Design a protein around this ligand. Structure first.
Ligand SMILES: [Mg+2]
Lengths: 239, 233, 240, 198, 238, 244, 198, 198, 198
């Protein structure tokens, strides 16, 4: 019973399930927040490197001056979502002045991923995504995850893509639910080491993008990310 | 072992049958029981509201469509509501436009021609519900038997539903009597009530299980709910 | 063999045969072209004593001059009648002159036609008999599921068509000059009874209508009342 | 083509429902002949079950039964082969349509077919009834159980008759039914009056 | 099965379509005159309960164009109608009455379109159009369900095609022209019936047949009576 | 397995596609509703994958209006749709009549939404192939029949209840409730009741994180009990067991 | 056609649920006769398992069992053939519709069918019970293991009874159930009241 | 109909999960009885593999094993036939729906079925264990390899025990699992609470 | 239900990948034991191919090989039955979904299954190796070809060893591979974490 727009005996829509199986096939992303920041980490499939470093793409994408998102799964797809989101980001601001609420955004995105699971003659987006940012005139960090089916959810820190299960575990016994990572510096320190499981040496496979309130934003440079690998392998050897 | 001729409402069996429509009549036999019976002064619908659980309400089966018309149903609630709903418009169209109260013969016509469409086109399925209709126009009383197969027949009384037989017979016999009960409502009912109680098996009918409807010569269509039917038990 | 549009290895549309197969299975209907005008009759089957007599009419008029009846799938019949009803009334509004029976059939034949062309639709499950008058006389035809129809001196379908057929055969020769308007009815009344002897254990109710410039006056009227009775009794004597 | 049809004609012309009606009718009352072949073998198992030991020499009443039974299998099989003949002669031109009628023919053939097979796993048991006893009556020079095995080889073969008879009745009756229902389809498998479309 | 290419590109629904045209069971033949045209078709009326008026496989499309069709009556009445109206719409939209050869084009065109786009099953009928237009005179063009037409100096449709054919062919290798030498239609008519009777090993009464004639712009169906008188004509002269 | 394709009728005249959708709702976490002449309670089991999900993120119980709350069970994506149509259906009415919509009248609209799905359409266009994989616990209060509780089933049908429970351990509770419920139940009573059947047929150690609880009254309207009220209420619960 | 129906009639008229009800009821209590044929063979394996060696001569109590068992197989098989007869007489006109009822009939026939097969792989073991012993009792002139093989050929055949009996009970019971559920479908396989459409 | 249900009733009423739970539980610990029947035959192949030649006369310890094994096959088979009985009694009315539950029943029956078949290709090897040796112990008048073939026919039959035992454990354990999971579906195969639609 | 899970639990708890890892590992190096059982029978066919005629008396080195081979079949079969046991215990609740994992289990079982069958067409050839020679060594009173047939019945059986060994290596290796790949699917056939939809 797999060609879904129909139900399994036990009430499943196996297609929608399988689609998730592709998000795992894809690369990996992870987000974390503090009481002032929200960092987004990602890896880099540095595989057939005989291509200009310069203009070729990188996971994290700004949707509005104060909000960004990342994914894992089909690049081919992902792009189209980002675009449609960016558009709605303005259509709002236009017809309402007030710039978008991160919760709202996601709900829109999830509404689209959700639209591609109803009419026969369309197929679901093989993309699950992490969306982070700070609401207009607000200082409370927000993190949400959306996935293929159409569900949106807020997390304190979450990860998607291949080997998410692992790092997830790691995170689970590191991120203190009671108090979030205070300083930005260390909030990063965290995420970085959490990716060092799958990375397999080299800040040459680790992308970091950091977001603060009041529409500030800022991707990271290679050495910056390296000075962390450094100051971490150091305390690992010190244990 | 096999049967291919039962795919869509659209395919004929080698002999000339529509199994899909035949099945819809089976779900009709699955729902609760209900009865209708007429005379020359009134018409009556009596039905057995069936509840799901013991902590739940009994699902009603009667519906008004105008001061002078109504019906009961055996089968799927949704399907029914639609049909009755469409019906409601049809009367309204007449009243507003022509300012004449819709004749029952004609009411059946429309419900034939309506349910008909679903037997000729691909994609859909047929209506899973039967209806007993009652009303009082200018040709006095009338009562109808409707099937998803688009067949509406004018009767003197009847029942549909699970174990609908025992009443159909009680009726078949006590006919000569009730067709003559004119001027007296409570009589037609008690009669109808007996005809139905003549089909129970789980147990007797209570104030919650019972439901009645009537319409006549000066009796605009009205329904009796629960403790209001108390007397007829 | 399972879809409506398709053809068999040697050019054959099976769905239409079954259509036909269902037409036979139902009640029996007839019609007769006489002196001037026509006469129809059908077989309502009283399945119980809880059926109001003189009630569920299977015969229907079109405009104010066309008799019409059929058999097979009852809702299919009803449906088809509606289309015929529009076509008529539209034409009428357009050309003023009440619609020529000759063409009428086609309008319908053409509509029954279509339902043999696409797979998404279901073939018409009824054979239909009808007729009426005009300027150049009365006519009578009979349309089948295939959509093919023609003009007959009298027609028949449903369960026992042969009974009435060989029955219609006779009339031809002894009255090769068209049977009397009056006698036409009472004769039809009989031809039915004879053909009913299959549903014999189950009683029934006969329905009759007719057209004639002399009797109906150009119109189509329901044979009910006094002429109706004797026409039965007439049948009731020969019924031995 | 003139001559060709004449053969197919004069052949179907010498066998028909007219013929088959008599097998159904013939094998209708004739079941009595089996309801009999039954009761006979029964009365007989009691004498074998209780007619204690002996010194041998071929039982006359037993062969009277097998001869009567093997006798019946013969009749029936010929009678069936006649019904079979009437059908094989009506198998229409092979093609991929109107195969509704043709199907019936085949299904019925498979059941008839079965009947004939049933009359052949025991329609020889006489030449086999006395086929294990020449081996059994020999070794005339004695197991005290071998003496008893002779008591059994007599009763065992009487049971096989009673039983084959019981089942047989059933098979026949089934076939009667089966024919009586379809038949018209068996002779007229295609109609072809459907030219009401052209 | 269904309407889209076989492995040897021959989508059989179109092929199957053909047998059904034939299947009806009637024979249609046609030949050119010199200032007229003619078609022969049989009129087998089985059921003694019908009415021969209502029967026919030839209809008056236009004031001058007639049509015969060896094929199932329901599908024919359709083709009849559309065509009948294409010409109607034509004269209007263009100023001059539509000729034989052309109607047969939109007609074949039409049947091609259907076939390729799948908007319906092809009609199982072969249409044989006749008339005489003042551009090519005695015209005769035929069309099949596989959407396709062409020209005939004289043709035939039926269960027994090539027989009716071969005769005419032989009668043609000798008469050597590409039509029938003769002034009167009555006379031509006579000729065809002649060439058909001879061709079936069969005889026809005055109702067993069906024929039409296309003249100098005034096409008419041959009726029951006039029809017989030609049998009178061609009885002694034989 | 032939006879499993949406608008197809079983030979016993049944629609499995529908019936399976029901089997979806099963997989949802448990939800329980209790109606008392004092007010109506809605409580649900949460069940969270990891401790990094922010509980309040799971909108299993939601407000439909000042006078009507709701709890869903099963497919979360599908929920959001019904919740939105409903929320809209409500406001619309108020704009038209300057009043409040009858709980059932509302409920009706929602069921009117559900069974409105075609397969190419034998007349009516219905853009949405299959049925909903979710049920509803609608619970409000109009001033005609006072406090009310309803069960929304994908089949386009519904029933009124005194107490009902949908989700994973449906019967585990329905059985329990079947013999715990009585008219003169006060509100405080009802809370500790839902809170007990959950814990029982629940899965883990009961605490505010794995269980959201709410209620609605004529007085204040639909209110979703914060983690404090719930937390202590657990105590008044786990304490009375010790005794009897 | 007048005569044709009469036969199909008088045949279905002499067998019915009325008849079958008695097999279900008859083979209901009669299981005791089997729950017995069991315990007998059991008590018997102990004497063979422990009744050390001998000098031969056909055991009377053993044949008492096989005679009692072969006796039962007989009954049952005849009784089944009767139920089988009742159904084959009700197989409707072969076609491709209403086959829901027909299907039931077939399924039940296959299970009954099985029962009869079961009663025939052992419903002959008496004429076979003493069939390996004439070979075993011979070679009367001695393997000290051959003496023990006679001890076994006695116990082995007592096990086969106990076991065939155990399974048999099951088969019967299954059949009882199966019938009791369907049955009405078995006699009334087509309804045909669906003429509410015409 | 009143009486009819009573039978179907009192039958399902005398067997149940209550009964089957004990086979699963019974045949749970009872595997020890097999984990034993194993170790016994093993210790024994060493004496045959090394207990050089002889002059014959039936080994007492070997029959002690075959008697213990043939003994076990018996138990198990009866125990299975009981589980089989419990299910066949719950096979619902035959039709084309709700067959999800019914399917389970069948699948499980096929696995149980297998178990029973396994206990019958070797649950007779005693009357066969000493069945090739009367042929082997004869020809008492000598191939010096024939002497060694007797050494083997002893060890070979001790291997068959160890092996059948090994596989057997597996089969049992599989069946335990299989039951424990489904079961509820086995007794309640149709629900029928779906009337929430009418 | 409390007790029910405990059994299914303590059973899967006493066998695991932990166990199977050792068969793959054990039957990894142990192939040497077969790569050996090979070379031995080879060196031996040369002495039989060329060790001209004789006067008979059972070859000691030959039984040394069959004893060593029959010895191996035994190990392997037990070792396989262990892997088989580990899987049958993990066959989930029968139904029509998630059958992706279940499928793997079955496929692998069919291959293991094969392995066991292979070890049984030759895992008895010792009691058969000397089974044709008692017939061959007899007829001790002479065809000068019969003498040569003894030369052959020695070499032929040495070939069968070499060959069975060759194939066997293959079968084992295949199985090693097959397990190593799937395995995780074999123990965890259903996941069920898909509740991310509810
Ligand atoms: Mg098409």
């Amino acid at each position: 019973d797999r060609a879904l727009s129909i139900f399994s005996p036990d009430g499943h829509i196996f297609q929608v399930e399988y689609a998730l199986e592709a998000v795992k096939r894809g690369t990996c992303a992870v987000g974390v927040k503090g009481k002032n920041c929200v960092v987004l980490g990602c890896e880099r499939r540095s595989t057939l490197k005989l291509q200009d470093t310069r203009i070729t793409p990188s996971k994290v994408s700004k949707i509005d001056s104060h909000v960004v998102l990342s994914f894992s799964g089909l690049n081919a797809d992902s792009r189209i979502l980002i675009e449609k989101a960016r558009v709605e980001a303005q259509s709002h601001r236009l017809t309402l002045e007030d710039p978008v609420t991160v919760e709202y955004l996601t709900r829109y995105v999830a509404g689209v991923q959700q639209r591609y699971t109803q009419s026969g003659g369309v197929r679901p987006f093989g993309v699950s995504t992490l969306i982070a940012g700070f609401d207009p005139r607000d200082d409370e960090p927000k993190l949400y995850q959306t996935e293929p089916s159409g569900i949106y959810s807020s997390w304190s820190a979450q990860t998607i893509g291949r080997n998410s299960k692992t790092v997830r575990e790691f995170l689970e016994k590191n991120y203190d639910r009671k108090e979030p990572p205070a300083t930005v510096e260390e909030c990063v320190k965290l995420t970085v080491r959490s990716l060092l499981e799958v990375v397999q040496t080299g800040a040459k496979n680790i992308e970091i993008t950091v977001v603060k309130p009041d529409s500030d934003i800022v991707a990271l440079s290679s050495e910056e990310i390296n000075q962390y690998v450094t100051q971490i392998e150091q305390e690992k050897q010190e244990q | 072992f096999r049967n291919n001729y039962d795919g869509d409402t659209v395919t004929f069996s080698p002999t000339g049958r529509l199994f899909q429509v035949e099945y819809a009549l089976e779900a009709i036999k699955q729902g609760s029981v209900t009865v209708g019976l007429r005379s020359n002064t009134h018409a009556v619908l009596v039905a057995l509201k069936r509840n799901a659980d013991e902590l739940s309400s009994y699902q009603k089966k009667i519906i008004k469509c105008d001061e002078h018309m109504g019906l009961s149903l055996a089968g799927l609630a949704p399907d029914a509501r639609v049909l009755s709903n469409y019906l409601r418009q049809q009367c309204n169209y007449s009243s507003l436009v022509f300012n004449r109260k819709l004749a029952v013969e004609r009411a059946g016509h429309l419900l034939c021609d309506k349910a008909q469409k679903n037997t000729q086109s691909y994609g859909g399925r047929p209506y899973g519900v039967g209806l007993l209709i009652i009303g009082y126009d200018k040709s006095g009383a009338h009562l109808l038997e409707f099937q998803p197969s688009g067949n509406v027949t004018e009767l003197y009384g009847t029942a549909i539903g699970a174990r609908s037989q025992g009443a159909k017979t009680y009726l078949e016999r006590t006919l000569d009597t009730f067709i003559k009960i004119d001027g007296n409502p409570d009589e037609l009912i008690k009669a109808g009530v007996e005809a139905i109680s003549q089909s129970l098996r789980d147990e007797s009918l209570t104030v919650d299980n019972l439901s009645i409807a009537i319409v006549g010569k000066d009796t605009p269509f009205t329904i009796y709910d629960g403790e209001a039917v108390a007397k007829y038990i | 063999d399972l879809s409506n549009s398709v053809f068999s290895p040697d050019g054959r549309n099976f769905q239409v045969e079954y259509a036909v197969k269902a037409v036979e299975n139902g009640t029996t209907s007839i019609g007769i072209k006489c002196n001037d005008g026509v006469v129809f009759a059908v077989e309502k089957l009283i399945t119980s004593k809880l059926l109001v007599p003189q009630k569920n009419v299977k015969i229907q008029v079109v405009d104010r001059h066309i008799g019409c009846v059929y058999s097979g799938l009852i809702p299919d019949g009803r449906h088809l009648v509606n289309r015929g009803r529009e076509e008529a009334a539209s034409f009428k509004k357009l050309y003023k002159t009440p619609i020529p029976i000759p063409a009428f059939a086609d309008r319908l034949g053409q509509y029954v036609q279509a339902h043999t062309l696409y797979n998404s639709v279901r073939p018409f499950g009824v054979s239909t008999i009808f007729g009426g008058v005009d300027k150049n006389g009365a006519h009578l035809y009979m349309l089948e599921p295939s959509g093919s129809y023609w003009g007959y001196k009298g027609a028949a379908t449903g369960k026992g068509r042969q009974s009435a057929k060989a029955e219609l055969e006779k009339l031809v020769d002894h009255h090769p000059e068209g049977l009397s308007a009056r006698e036409a009815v009472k004769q039809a009344a009989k031809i039915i009874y004879l053909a009913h002897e299959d549903n014999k254990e189950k009683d029934f109710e006969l329905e009759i209508s007719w057209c004639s410039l002399s009797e109906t006056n150009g119109l189509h009227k329901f044979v009910k009342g006094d002429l109706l009775q004797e026409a039965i009794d007439f049948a009731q004597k020969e019924i031995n | 083509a003139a001559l060709i049809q004449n053969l197919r004609d004069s052949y179907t012309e010498t066998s028909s429902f007219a013929v088959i009606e008599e097998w159904a009718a013939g094998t209708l009352q004739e079941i009595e002949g089996i309801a009999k072949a039954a009761a006979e073998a029964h009365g007989v198992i009691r004498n074998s079950t209780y007619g204690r030991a002996q010194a041998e020499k071929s039982p006359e009443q037993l062969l009277g039964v097998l001869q009567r039974y093997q006798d019946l299998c013969h009749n029936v099989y010929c009678q069936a082969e006649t019904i079979r003949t009437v059908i094989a002669i009506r198998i229409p031109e092979h093609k991929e349509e109107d195969n509704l009628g043709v199907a019936v023919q085949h299904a019925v053939l498979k059941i008839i077919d079965e009947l004939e097979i049933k009359t052949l796993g025991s329609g020889e048991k006489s030449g086999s009834g006395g086929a294990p006893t020449p081996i059994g009556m020999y070794a005339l020079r004695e197991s005290p159980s071998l003496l008893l095995e002779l008591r059994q080889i007599d009763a065992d073969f009487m049971l096989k008759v009673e039983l084959a008879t019981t089942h047989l009745s059933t098979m026949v009756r089934a076939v009667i039914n089966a024919y009586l229902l379809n038949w018209k389809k068996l002779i007229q498998p295609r109609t072809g009056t459907d030219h009401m479309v052209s | 099965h269904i309407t889209i290419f076989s492995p040897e590109g021959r989508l059989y629904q179109v092929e199957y379509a053909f047998k059904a045209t034939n299947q009806t069971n009637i024979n249609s033949l046609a030949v050119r005159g010199k200032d007229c045209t003619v078609v022969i078709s049989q009129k087998k009326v089985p059921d003694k309960l019908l009415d021969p008026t209502t029967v026919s496989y030839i209809f008056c499309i236009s004031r001058t164009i007639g049509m015969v069709v060896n094929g199932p009556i329901p599908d024919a009445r359709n083709a009849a109608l559309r065509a009948k109206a294409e010409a109607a719409e034509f004269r209007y939209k263009y100023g001059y009455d539509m000729p034989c050869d052309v109607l047969a084009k939109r007609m074949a065109n039409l049947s091609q379109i259907y076939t390729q786009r799948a908007y319906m099953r092809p009609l199982g009928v072969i249409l044989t159009f006749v008339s005489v237009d003042e551009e090519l005179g005695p015209s005769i063009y035929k069309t099949d369900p596989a959407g396709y037409y062409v020209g005939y100096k004289a043709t035939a449709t039926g269960p027994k095609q090539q027989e009716i054919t071969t005769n005419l062919e032989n009668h043609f290798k000798k008469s050597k022209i590409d039509h029938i030498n003769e002034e009167s239609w009555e006379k031509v008519v006579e000729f065809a019936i002649t060439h058909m009777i001879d061709a079936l090993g069969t005889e026809f009464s005055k109702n067993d047949l069906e024929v039409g004639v296309a003249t100098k712009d005034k096409f008419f169906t041959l009726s029951a009576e006039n029809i017989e008188e030609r049998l009178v004509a061609i009885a002694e002269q034989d | 397995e032939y006879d499993r394709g949406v608008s197809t009728f079983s030979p016993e005249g049944r629609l499995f596609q529908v019936e399976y959708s029901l089997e979806a709702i099963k997989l949802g976490s448990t939800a329980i509703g209790i109606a008392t002449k004092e007010g109506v309670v809605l409580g649900v089991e949460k069940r969270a994958t990891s401790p990094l999900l922010e509980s309040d993120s799971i909108e299993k119980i939601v407000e439909i209006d000042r006078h009507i709350g709701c709890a869903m069970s099963g497919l979360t994506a599908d929920a959001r749709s019904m919740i939105e149509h409903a929320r809209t259906a409500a406001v619309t009415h108020n704009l038209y009549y300057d009043e409040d919509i009858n709980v059932e009248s509302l409920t009706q609209s929602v069921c009117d939404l559900a069974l409105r799905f075609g397969e190419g359409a034998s007349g009516e266009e219905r853009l949405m192939s299959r049925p909903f994989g979710v049920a509803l616990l609608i619970a409000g209060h109009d001033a005609d029949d006072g406090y009310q509780l309803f069960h929304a089933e994908p089949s386009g049908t519904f029933y009124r209840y005194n107490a009902k429970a949908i989700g994973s351990g449906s019967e585990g509770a329905q059985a329990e409730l079947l013999n715990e419920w009585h008219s003169s139940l006060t509100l405080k009573e009802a809370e500790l009741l839902v809170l007990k059947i959950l814990k029982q047929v629940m899965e883990e150690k009961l605490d505010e994180n794995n269980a959201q609880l709410s209620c609605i009254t004529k007085q204040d309207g639909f209110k979703i009990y914060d983690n404090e009220k719930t937390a202590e209420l657990i105590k008044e619960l786990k304490e009375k067991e010790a005794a009897e």
